[PDB]
Design an enzyme around this catalytic site. Structure first.
Site, PDB file in Angstrom:
ATOM      1  N   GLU B  59     118.640  -2.933  10.121  1.00 47.05           N
ATOM      2  CA  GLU B  59     119.771  -3.564   9.135  1.00 47.05           C
ATOM      3  C   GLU B  59     121.556  -3.720   9.583  1.00 47.05           C
ATOM      4  N   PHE B 121     113.110  11.935  -1.604  1.00 47.48           N
ATOM      5  CA  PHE B 121     113.015  10.421  -0.152  1.00 47.48           C
ATOM      6  C   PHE B 121     113.258   9.625  -0.399  1.00 47.48           C
ATOM      7  N   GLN B 122     114.037   9.621   1.263  1.00 43.43           N
ATOM      8  CA  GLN B 122     114.703   8.222   1.729  1.00 43.43           C
ATOM      9  C   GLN B 122     115.997   8.179   0.655  1.00 43.43           C
ATOM     10  N   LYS B 171     115.687   1.712  -8.856  1.00 39.67           N
ATOM     11  CA  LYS B 171     114.460   1.637  -8.328  1.00 39.67           C
ATOM     12  C   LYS B 171     114.032   1.488  -9.541  1.00 39.67           C
ATOM     13  N   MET B 492     136.031  -2.557  30.264  1.00 41.28           N
ATOM     14  CA  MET B 492     137.441  -2.430  29.630  1.00 41.28           C
ATOM     15  C   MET B 492     137.758  -0.630  29.708  1.00 41.28           C
TER      16      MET B 492
HETATM   17  C1  LIG Z   1     106.254   7.135   4.554  1.00 44.06           C
HETATM   18  C2  LIG Z   1     106.114   8.952   4.498  1.00 44.06           C
HETATM   19  C3  LIG Z   1     104.740   9.691   3.644  1.00 44.06           C
HETATM   20  C4  LIG Z   1     105.129  10.719   3.787  1.00 44.06           C
HETATM   21  N1  LIG Z   1     103.704  11.720   3.413  1.00 44.06           N
HETATM   22  C5  LIG Z   1     103.907  13.038   3.042  1.00 44.06           C
HETATM   23  C6  LIG Z   1     102.955  13.874   2.928  1.00 44.06           C
HETATM   24  O1  LIG Z   1     102.097  13.604   2.738  1.00 44.06           O
HETATM   25  N2  LIG Z   1     103.094  15.234   2.966  1.00 44.06           N
HETATM   26  C7  LIG Z   1     103.850  15.955   3.420  1.00 44.06           C
HETATM   27  O2  LIG Z   1     104.052  16.925   3.827  1.00 44.06           O
HETATM   28  N3  LIG Z   1     104.977  14.824   4.005  1.00 44.06           N
HETATM   29  C8  LIG Z   1     105.444  13.273   3.273  1.00 44.06           C
HETATM   30  N4  LIG Z   1     106.597  13.017   3.850  1.00 44.06           N
HETATM   31  C9  LIG Z   1     107.457  14.026   4.214  1.00 44.06           C
HETATM   32  C10 LIG Z   1     108.555  14.302   3.419  1.00 44.06           C
HETATM   33  O3  LIG Z   1     109.354  13.333   3.300  1.00 44.06           O
HETATM   34  C11 LIG Z   1     108.866  15.384   4.003  1.00 44.06           C
HETATM   35  O4  LIG Z   1     110.087  15.224   4.585  1.00 44.06           O
HETATM   36  C12 LIG Z   1     108.398  16.856   3.818  1.00 44.06           C
HETATM   37  O5  LIG Z   1     107.388  17.405   3.391  1.00 44.06           O
HETATM   38  C13 LIG Z   1     109.773  18.303   4.197  1.00 44.06           C
HETATM   39  O6  LIG Z   1     108.412  19.057   5.004  1.00 44.06           O
HETATM   40  P1  LIG Z   1     109.351  20.885   5.303  1.00 44.06           P
HETATM   41  O7  LIG Z   1     109.842  21.415   3.663  1.00 44.06           O
HETATM   42  O8  LIG Z   1     107.845  21.477   5.621  1.00 44.06           O
HETATM   43  O9  LIG Z   1     110.365  20.873   5.227  1.00 44.06           O
HETATM   44  P2  LIG Z   1     111.983  20.259   4.881  1.00 44.06           P
HETATM   45  O10 LIG Z   1     112.210  19.280   4.918  1.00 44.06           O
HETATM   46  O11 LIG Z   1     112.808  20.677   6.755  1.00 44.06           O
HETATM   47  O12 LIG Z   1     112.458  22.010   4.035  1.00 44.06           O
HETATM   48  C14 LIG Z   1     111.935  22.753   5.063  1.00 44.06           C
HETATM   49  C15 LIG Z   1     112.369  24.037   3.832  1.00 44.06           C
HETATM   50  O13 LIG Z   1     112.660  25.043   4.262  1.00 44.06           O
HETATM   51  C16 LIG Z   1     113.837  26.532   4.627  1.00 44.06           C
HETATM   52  N5  LIG Z   1     113.743  26.683   5.796  1.00 44.06           N
HETATM   53  C17 LIG Z   1     114.694  26.256   6.567  1.00 44.06           C
HETATM   54  N6  LIG Z   1     114.174  27.289   7.648  1.00 44.06           N
HETATM   55  C18 LIG Z   1     114.125  28.132   6.721  1.00 44.06           C
HETATM   56  C19 LIG Z   1     113.949  30.025   7.835  1.00 44.06           C
HETATM   57  N7  LIG Z   1     114.099  30.491   8.813  1.00 44.06           N
HETATM   58  N8  LIG Z   1     113.561  30.420   7.072  1.00 44.06           N
HETATM   59  C20 LIG Z   1     112.600  30.312   5.452  1.00 44.06           C
HETATM   60  N9  LIG Z   1     113.107  29.444   4.916  1.00 44.06           N
HETATM   61  C21 LIG Z   1     113.541  28.356   6.100  1.00 44.06           C
HETATM   62  C22 LIG Z   1     114.519  25.136   4.711  1.00 44.06           C
HETATM   63  O14 LIG Z   1     115.791  25.565   3.741  1.00 44.06           O
HETATM   64  C23 LIG Z   1     113.930  24.261   3.389  1.00 44.06           C
HETATM   65  O15 LIG Z   1     114.463  24.303   2.619  1.00 44.06           O
HETATM   66  C24 LIG Z   1     106.145  11.529   4.167  1.00 44.06           C
HETATM   67  C25 LIG Z   1     107.401  10.858   4.664  1.00 44.06           C
HETATM   68  C26 LIG Z   1     107.476   9.860   4.671  1.00 44.06           C
HETATM   69  C27 LIG Z   1     108.350   9.087   6.017  1.00 44.06           C
HETATM   70  C1  LIG Z   2     140.057  -4.247  22.619  1.00 43.61           C
HETATM   71  C2  LIG Z   2     140.800  -5.196  21.916  1.00 43.61           C
HETATM   72  C3  LIG Z   2     142.480  -5.951  22.280  1.00 43.61           C
HETATM   73  C4  LIG Z   2     143.014  -6.393  20.699  1.00 43.61           C
HETATM   74  N1  LIG Z   2     144.879  -6.268  21.981  1.00 43.61           N
HETATM   75  C5  LIG Z   2     145.424  -7.877  20.521  1.00 43.61           C
HETATM   76  C6  LIG Z   2     146.449  -8.587  21.197  1.00 43.61           C
HETATM   77  O1  LIG Z   2     146.994  -8.578  22.525  1.00 43.61           O
HETATM   78  N2  LIG Z   2     146.816  -9.056  19.972  1.00 43.61           N
HETATM   79  C7  LIG Z   2     146.185  -9.512  19.063  1.00 43.61           C
HETATM   80  O2  LIG Z   2     147.089 -10.279  18.376  1.00 43.61           O
HETATM   81  N3  LIG Z   2     145.465  -8.368  18.412  1.00 43.61           N
HETATM   82  C8  LIG Z   2     144.573  -7.741  19.517  1.00 43.61           C
HETATM   83  N4  LIG Z   2     143.254  -7.016  18.747  1.00 43.61           N
HETATM   84  C9  LIG Z   2     143.245  -7.241  17.118  1.00 43.61           C
HETATM   85  C10 LIG Z   2     143.944  -6.319  17.100  1.00 43.61           C
HETATM   86  O3  LIG Z   2     143.551  -4.594  16.725  1.00 43.61           O
HETATM   87  C11 LIG Z   2     143.804  -6.679  14.999  1.00 43.61           C
HETATM   88  O4  LIG Z   2     142.479  -6.804  14.933  1.00 43.61           O
HETATM   89  C12 LIG Z   2     144.311  -8.137  14.833  1.00 43.61           C
HETATM   90  O5  LIG Z   2     146.151  -8.260  15.603  1.00 43.61           O
HETATM   91  C13 LIG Z   2     144.833  -8.184  13.455  1.00 43.61           C
HETATM   92  O6  LIG Z   2     145.569  -9.639  13.448  1.00 43.61           O
HETATM   93  P1  LIG Z   2     145.356  -9.729  12.046  1.00 43.61           P
HETATM   94  O7  LIG Z   2     146.769  -9.084  11.351  1.00 43.61           O
HETATM   95  O8  LIG Z   2     146.500 -11.613  11.815  1.00 43.61           O
HETATM   96  O9  LIG Z   2     144.520  -9.563  11.015  1.00 43.61           O
HETATM   97  P2  LIG Z   2     144.129  -8.506   9.524  1.00 43.61           P
HETATM   98  O10 LIG Z   2     144.164  -7.065  10.338  1.00 43.61           O
HETATM   99  O11 LIG Z   2     142.948  -9.383   8.910  1.00 43.61           O
HETATM  100  O12 LIG Z   2     145.519  -8.452   8.491  1.00 43.61           O
HETATM  101  C14 LIG Z   2     146.044 -10.025   7.849  1.00 43.61           C
HETATM  102  C15 LIG Z   2     147.085 -10.008   6.672  1.00 43.61           C
HETATM  103  O13 LIG Z   2     147.699 -10.719   6.561  1.00 43.61           O
HETATM  104  C16 LIG Z   2     147.114  -9.897   4.706  1.00 43.61           C
HETATM  105  N5  LIG Z   2     146.006 -11.090   4.112  1.00 43.61           N
HETATM  106  C17 LIG Z   2     145.002 -11.440   3.462  1.00 43.61           C
HETATM  107  N6  LIG Z   2     145.042 -12.470   3.279  1.00 43.61           N
HETATM  108  C18 LIG Z   2     146.296 -13.895   3.039  1.00 43.61           C
HETATM  109  C19 LIG Z   2     146.442 -14.072   1.432  1.00 43.61           C
HETATM  110  N7  LIG Z   2     145.245 -15.178   1.765  1.00 43.61           N
HETATM  111  N8  LIG Z   2     147.916 -14.384   1.598  1.00 43.61           N
HETATM  112  C20 LIG Z   2     148.558 -13.347   2.210  1.00 43.61           C
HETATM  113  N9  LIG Z   2     148.403 -12.268   3.116  1.00 43.61           N
HETATM  114  C21 LIG Z   2     147.176 -12.249   3.035  1.00 43.61           C
HETATM  115  C22 LIG Z   2     146.064  -8.781   4.725  1.00 43.61           C
HETATM  116  O14 LIG Z   2     145.688  -7.922   3.859  1.00 43.61           O
HETATM  117  C23 LIG Z   2     146.666  -8.692   6.192  1.00 43.61           C
HETATM  118  O15 LIG Z   2     147.390  -7.632   5.481  1.00 43.61           O
HETATM  119  C24 LIG Z   2     142.313  -6.830  19.853  1.00 43.61           C
HETATM  120  C25 LIG Z   2     141.008  -6.299  20.069  1.00 43.61           C
HETATM  121  C26 LIG Z   2     140.357  -5.275  20.025  1.00 43.61           C
HETATM  122  C27 LIG Z   2     139.083  -4.723  20.492  1.00 43.61           C
END
Ligand SMILES: Cc1cc2nc3c(=O)[nH]c(=O)nc-3n(C[C@H](O)[C@H](O)[C@H](O)COP(=O)(O)OP(=O)(O)OC[C@H]3O[C@@H](n4cnc5c(N)ncnc54)[C@H](O)[C@@H]3O)c2cc1C
Ligand SMILES: Cc1cc2nc3c(=O)[nH]c(=O)nc-3n(C[C@H](O)[C@H](O)[C@H](O)COP(=O)(O)OP(=O)(O)OC[C@H]3O[C@@H](n4cnc5c(N)ncnc54)[C@H](O)[C@@H]3O)c2cc1C
Ligand SMILES: Cc1cc2nc3c(=O)[nH]c(=O)nc-3n(C[C@H](O)[C@H](O)[C@H](O)COP(=O)(O)OP(=O)(O)OC[C@H]3O[C@@H](n4cnc5c(N)ncnc54)[C@H](O)[C@@H]3O)c2cc1C
Ligand SMILES: C/C(=C(/S)CCOP(=O)(O)OP(=O)(O)O)N(C=O)Cc1cnc(C)nc1N
Ligand SMILES: C/C(=C(/S)CCOP(=O)(O)OP(=O)(O)O)N(C=O)Cc1cnc(C)nc1N
Ligand SMILES: CCOC(=O)c1ccccc1S(=O)(=O)NC(=O)Nc1nc(Cl)cc(OC)n1
Ligand SMILES: CCOC(=O)c1ccccc1S(=O)(=O)NC(=O)Nc1nc(Cl)cc(OC)n1
Ligand SMILES: [K+]
Ligand SMILES: [K+]
Ligand SMILES: [Mg+2]
Ligand SMILES: [Mg+2]
Lengths: 597, 597, 217
Positions: B59, B121-122, B171, B492
């Site tokens: 992503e 979850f997620q 969702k 760099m």
């Molecule tokens: C695609 C997918 C499918 C999944 N399907 C399943 C499934 O079918 N079955 C399943 O089990 N999981 C499934 N999961 C995983 C699930 O989302 C959870 O991550 C998992 O179930 C959490 O397990 P847990 O409660 O043991 O661990 P944790 O999430 O880490 O929870 C641990 C708990 O114990 C507590 N704790 C930590 N340390 C201590 C300590 N020293 N003493 C006392 N308590 C403590 C924590 O505070 C917490 O409340 C799936 C994940 C994915 C990605």
């Molecule tokens: C390794 C490295 C080295 C670098 N060294 C240099 C260097 O030597 N020289 C250099 O120039 N840069 C250098 N940079 C880049 C620098 O960090 C800046 O990203 C860059 O200078 C910003 O340029 P800018 O002000 O034109 O653009 P921007 O950061 O986008 O600023 C644009 C400004 O114009 C405004 N603006 C936007 N749209 C409009 C509009 N329609 N009308 C009026 N205003 C508007 C914005 O609000 C903003 O204030 C370097 C970057 C890296 C990663």
């Protein structure tokens, strides 16, 4: 007075102080990537022989590596990145670590304090951005408070429910030199009657139970004695044990008391058992929505028992936030589950037999195996079969075996079909469910456990997310074993599209590179298994390898993970595998897609 | 009444409404990746012939692709991702888009409203996390407000200073069906006297000026007539023109009035000129700290002129936040710079000659070229020479040429040594400075401009960050041209370590894959140039290719980018290239590293 | 104004910079901005809730502020209590929603409420919660709250029926056996015709009358 102040750090830069504090916190590994804002720290750790530095290709890699390291070792994973994009790149690993309770300590460079708030070069508001995905964060404002902030970070990361913390390090602070003495306490790292009464009450409840079940999770793994005391309890009171995905390995699945994994894709036997139990002993598990099924329909028998004063839910939990969050606990036992088990078990009555209960359980295990459609002549390898093969062969080495995964069908099949026996051997992204986790987690786990066999069971789409880290494994000297289940699809999503969207596969087929040429380009050994007859010998070559190795296996496409508890359904309202149903599904899919799938 | 309400969307799902609103906003391209939470939207856009969908491998790729698309096209880049890790993976691109003023509209799936706040979850708190790196965000809470929220998002993204917005899509909302009519306004997309007086005052100030200079940036590119009116002003009042990195292409660098790029690594002629000008006309530029040098020592002559009522700084800026943020404007002209130039220029006195001023300027340009150490017999190709070769050969095709970059030395050399002539042909990460930007930005730019030559000038470390997106270019049918300057270093950062940390290269050498085998594995054409004699013919093969192509060039290592204004120094206090100094530096580096570097 | 008055009503703030309020509108604006303004899932929940109440032998209405956010609110509350013959207790904020002179009135419940109302809710097999949020001044010790209604729920003969407009307050404190989302008054219009008319509850009202007699203020 002079005994309470320390001047031993005077004359050191912030960077050098960082280095010294890492040593004092027994950090042996740092995962990171350089940049302008963090250069004073990188200069201080230059050629350090005090810890191993691991360089990824992307800071997301560093983050997931540190997670893998932490879960394998039980120590905090330390990340060191630069400002701006270096720091924003660690956000997914931080959110990941938060959801799965992983102790992650992230140090991010920052622009000088004189430049903060000016939209400076490479300035991100990482304290603001990371606030919702850390337990705690802070920006260090002067070198004198740097040792204190480092202590606080490690302490917060590793106590309570473990989780990620971030410490922001402005460049002028790390470049500046300490000129003043500081409190000597900051230069060094670190049972209530109410709970005691709750434990006694919980014991009395269990001692009445006729259908008990232990529901154990990740928390039991946060103490070395955890699995030991779990087994002691299950043996003494004669109780069947199910675990979460994150609890896999906490209980020996070869034991007859093992009900395997529960939940959405867990064993229908475990799911049936928890829905019929009169007493549920929840040990370090948080009743996640992948586990409970439809919440209002969850654990009917235990709720009835609670109302009738003969059972219920006994929740051993360290974080008050997770007590009574999802389901009401009959008794809540707050604190470390292992420590509280030491007080609990001697109050629990020893039980020799539970004839009627274990008769049901054994019957349930017999009728609910992890069944699937076996290979047929000429067919592709079934993914379930591949997992079994890897599990069987890996167990025959005289080495610890650690498994990491990506996210998807392969992950669930890995969970189901491996036989789990040891703690901290399942390292998988469960709460957030981050694709791409598998490879860098394996690298981190391998660095933590240099003598272990580390296997990344990965999906092709997941592996694509972070495959650049193959180079990192080589440069780190980490002989990880990557197995890509290549079904040429985002299988978990196509399963849902098959089931709920009438086989409309909307953008769920990404093109794959040539994985053998990819491995070659990365200087990694490559093995490709394309048919049933190559399976056994291919897996053996994979496991026998003594260098980083990538195994690609061509597997059957459009195969659902089963059993499955669909959204909205009760935990015991599951879909089971059926040969005839699968055949009809295949025909339907073929017709609807014009034979494309 | 019935004329003000609309019922045409009744019966549609949130997903289908999303689809329809994309059409109404003239979206022709969406960059995204599927997942469970966003499936109702993916089902609605299934096999849509209304826009092109581009699938990355990660992503972050989608995000940077959308950025490249936006900067090449002047349209908003649209991103569609799932909840949790899908959404947190877009954070770096959002922060990137914010810093560089890029119109990015991010749609992220979210867990059902019934699950939000339960650590589901997620589930990520993406509204909280993305707050500091978006102009604005929102979580849609019911399908009836979905069209309105989409309108607001596009409007905010594209007005004022353009920037990223995020819209969170639960969702159950996208799956739900609209049952009620909605305000018809929501189903369709969209000079103060104070400013007029400021313009008149600004004109009078310029009409007094004896040493004027135009300082032009990205803002002039946000209107098609921008570069036209810039040229009209410079011609009429006879004014030399310098631009920022992000303004490159706004002014024809072949014109005698061109002073090239100013700043830290800009032309010493441009830097000298701005430090000596009595009137600075700032056109859509924000006085970033890469440009100003030491702020208290910036533009001495223009500050003096302002105090004496004969000059100063005239700031044409659309965002009030950036007026008087860094330097005090003598006159602030608020609004779109192009529109305000239409009012400004007719008040400006035409000037035929400025003998003494242009004599200085021409002298400065002559003594301050972009000099460097040329190739010698047997030496590696110099990176500066490679850039010149690509620039010269690319100009000879009858096609538009668009350049993207990674971040580092290669980026600066690309800026210096290309000859910039057309607007929106430099697509580079400037504010945040995100390594890995180059390849996905090129893909996005190529999709926006299918008939253009799109060249990604990339570093080896930068390219490693996101090289998995090579597969994406192939699957998208985007014939991008990637040139990796392989100096086998994070150049760099090693430049700074050489200069400020006594050649202590702390973790700044990552191992590279075999780029030719990598390209082969990705189904991309590969070319490797290893010596001076292969340079010309290799670049020609590169540019003649009609398919995605990866060119690797082995270039000289440990070569500094010059000129350079070091941190803390005035803009005219620069380091210049010197052959003898370079030789001594080489000897010193060799001695200190034991001949390793 | 829309956000303030919809869902659960609440405060909103609008910040007005002086140069904005002093400035003059020079451009036309969308005419919509110059003017002020039953799901099958909920329908099924209502039917289920009715069936649960129709089984109940010791029902009680627990009514709060939400019933006051519609003019017909108190009317429909009375209609329900009369038809199914149910005693009514209210929160502090619900006072006035039910005529306390009526024999069915149990007065206020809670920390400083009537011991009769408190006894009744602890012994009821079905609790009909109408626009009330189970605040901690009302529930007492949460784990010990409504024992009889929890038992009934587990045995499929009762429980807690929660009529609530804000999803945030559904299942926040206590688990609802049935959750009925939306305006309580509107949902009562659909609920009451599905509810069986009851003439007498001799054993229940005998307890209630005894409790009121021994627990005056
Ligand atoms: C695609 C997918 C499918 C999944 N399907 C399943 C499934 O079918 N079955 C399943 O089990 N999981 C499934 N999961 C995983 C699930 O989302 C959870 O991550 C998992 O179930 C959490 O397990 P847990 O409660 O043991 O661990 P944790 O999430 O880490 O929870 C641990 C708990 O114990 C507590 N704790 C930590 N340390 C201590 C300590 N020293 N003493 C006392 N308590 C403590 C924590 O505070 C917490 O409340 C799936 C994940 C994915 C990605
Ligand atoms: C390794 C490295 C080295 C670098 N060294 C240099 C260097 O030597 N020289 C250099 O120039 N840069 C250098 N940079 C880049 C620098 O960090 C800046 O990203 C860059 O200078 C910003 O340029 P800018 O002000 O034109 O653009 P921007 O950061 O986008 O600023 C644009 C400004 O114009 C405004 N603006 C936007 N749209 C409009 C509009 N329609 N009308 C009026 N205003 C508007 C914005 O609000 C903003 O204030 C370097 C970057 C890296 C990663
Ligand atoms: C010193 C002191 C002592 C107190 N002791 C007591 C006590 O003994 N007993 C007592 O009852 N209170 C007591 N309180 C008051 C208590 O703190 C609460 O304020 C009160 O109980 C809340 O009552 P309520 O739930 O009816 O109103 P609210 O707090 O307003 O809750 C109303 C609920 O109905 C929902 N709702 C709103 N509109 C609608 C609609 N149209 N349709 C459906 N649902 C809707 C709301 O979303 C909300 O969930 C005391 C207060 C003080 C200061
Ligand atoms: C798209 C997706 C998933 S799980 C696709 C999985 O693809 P693959 O690796 O081939 O595994 P599989 O075929 O064995 O099942 N998602 C669901 O979890 C969404 C998702 C999207 N993006 C990220 C970073 N993570 C995610 N989990
Ligand atoms: C490490 C780094 C940089 S710029 C290294 C650049 O490596 P490379 O691609 O080989 O370019 P070059 O050799 O031509 O100079 N950083 C400074 O900008 C820090 C940095 C670190 N991480 C990210 C994602 N972005 C960054 N800009
Ligand atoms: C990249 C980090 O930049 C900063 O820390 C920074 C930001 C804003 C103002 C001053 C500085 S600074 O002067 O204290 N440091 C730099 O400017 N460092 C810097 N390092 C590298 Cl390797 C390159 C660079 O400019 C390209 N600049
Ligand atoms: C992954 C998105 O999950 C959710 O949206 C989600 C989260 C928490 C509770 C209920 C749901 S849901 O029931 O409305 N949707 C799912 O649970 N979807 C879902 N999709 C896929 Cl492809 C896989 C999966 O479980 C592995 N679950
Ligand atoms: K198993
Ligand atoms: K140039
Ligand atoms: Mg797959
Ligand atoms: Mg390099």
């Amino acid at each position: 007075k002079e005994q309470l102040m320390d001047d031993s750090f005077i004359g050191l830069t912030g960077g050098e102080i960082f280095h010294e504090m890492m040593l004092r916190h027994k950090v042996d590994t740092v995962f990171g990537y350089a940049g302008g804002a963090i250069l004073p720290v990188f200069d201080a750790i230059y050629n350090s022989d005090k810890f191993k530095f691991v360089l990824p290709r992307h800071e997301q890699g560093a983050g997931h590596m540190a997670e893998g390291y932490a879960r394998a070792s039980g120590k905090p994973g330390v990340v060191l990145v630069t400002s701006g994009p270096g720091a924003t790149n660690v956000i997914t690993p931080m959110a990941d670590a938060l959801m799965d309770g992983v102790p992650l300590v992230v140090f991010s460079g920052q622009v000088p304090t004189t430049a903060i708030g000016t939209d400076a070069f490479q300035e991100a508001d990482i304290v603001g951005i990371s606030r919702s995905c850390t337990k705690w964060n802070v920006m260090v404002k002067n070198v004198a408070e740097l040792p204190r902030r480092i202590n606080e970070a490690f302490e917060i990361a590793t106590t309570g429910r473990p989780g990620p913390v971030l410490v922001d390090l402005p460049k002028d602070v790390t470049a500046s030199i300490l000129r003043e003495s500081i409190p000597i306490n900051t230069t060094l790292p670190s049972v209530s009657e109410f709970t005691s009464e709750a434990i006694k009450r919980a014991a009395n409840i269990l001692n009445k139970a006729k259908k008990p079940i232990i529901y154990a999770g990740a928390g039991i793994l946060n103490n070395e004695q955890g699995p030991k005391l779990l087994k002691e309890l299950a043996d003494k009171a004669n109780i069947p044990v199910t675990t979460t995905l994150q609890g896999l390995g906490a209980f020996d699945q070869r034991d007859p008391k093992s009900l395997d994994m529960l939940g959405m894709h867990g064993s229908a036997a475990a799911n049936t058992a928890i829905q019929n139990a009169d007493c549920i002993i929840a040990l370090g598990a948080r009743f996640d929505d992948r586990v409970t099924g439809n919440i209002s329909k969850f654990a009917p028998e235990a709720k009835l028992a609670a109302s009738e004063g003969r059972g219920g839910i006994l929740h051993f939990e360290i974080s008050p936030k997770n007590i009574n969050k999802v389901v009401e606990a009959t008794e809540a036992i707050e604190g470390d589950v292992t420590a509280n088990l030491q007080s609990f078990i001697p109050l629990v009555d020893s039980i020799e037999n539970r004839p009627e209960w274990f008769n049901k359980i054994n019957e349930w295990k017999k009728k609910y195996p992890y069944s699937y459609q076996l290979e047929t002549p000429g067919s592709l390898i079934k993914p379930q079969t591949l997992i079994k093969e890897i599990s069987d062969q890996a167990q025959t080495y005289n080495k610890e075996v650690i498994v990491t995964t990506g996210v998807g069908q392969h992950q669930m099949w890995a969970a189901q079909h491996f036989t789990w026996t040891q703690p901290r051997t399942m390292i998988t992204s469960g709460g957030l469910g981050t694709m791409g986790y598998g490879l860098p987690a394996a690298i981190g786990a391998q660095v933590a456990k240099p003598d272990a066999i580390v296997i990344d069971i990965d999906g092709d789409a997941s592996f694509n997310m972070t495959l650049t880290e193959l180079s990192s494994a080589v440069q780190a000297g980490a002989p990880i074993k990557v197995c890509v289940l290549n079904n040429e699809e985002q299988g978990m999503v196509t399963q849902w599209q098959s089931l709920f969207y009438e086989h409309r596969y909307s953008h769920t087929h990404q093109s794959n590179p040539d994985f053998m040429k990819l491995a070659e380009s990365m200087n990694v050994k490559g093995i490709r298994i394309t048919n049933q007859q190559e399976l056994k010998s291919g897996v053996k070559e994979f496991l026998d390898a003594t260098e980083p190795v990538l195994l690609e296996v061509i597997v059957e496409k459009k195969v659902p993970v089963l059993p499955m508890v669909p959204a909205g359904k009760a935990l015991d309202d599951f879909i089971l595998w059926d040969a005839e149903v699968e055949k009809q599904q295949n025909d339907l899919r073929k017709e609807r897609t014009g034979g494309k799938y």
